[PDB]
Amino acid sequence: DEPTSSTGALTEFVKKMRATARKLTLPQGSRDWNSMAVRTRSYMEDLHL
C-alpha cells in the first residue's frame, strides 16, 4: 500500500518481504519469481535487498 503511510503499512511490508525471502529460499525450488519460468532455487546469503 505505502511504506511511509503508517506503522501498520510498514510492518505489513516487512512481513511481505520476509515471506517472499523465505519462499525464494525454499529448498525444493519454484518457477514463480524469474523472468522466464525455470525451476530454480536461491540461497539466503546471496539475496540483496
With CB under 8 A as the contact rule, the residue among 15, 33, 34, 47 that binds a copy of itself is 15
DSSP state of 3: T
The answer to the question of residue 14 lying near a copy of itself (CB under 8 A) is yes
The answer to the question of residue 31 lying near a copy of itself (CB under 8 A) is no
Long-range contact set of residues 40-49: C-beta below 8 Å, sequence gap at least 24: 47/21, 49/17
Contact 26/41 with Cβ under 8 angstroms?
yes
With CB under 8 A as the contact rule, the residue among 3, 9, 33, 47 that binds a copy of itself is 9
The answer to the question of residue 7 lying near a copy of itself (CB under 8 A) is yes
The answer to the question of residue 34 lying near a copy of itself (CB under 8 A) is no
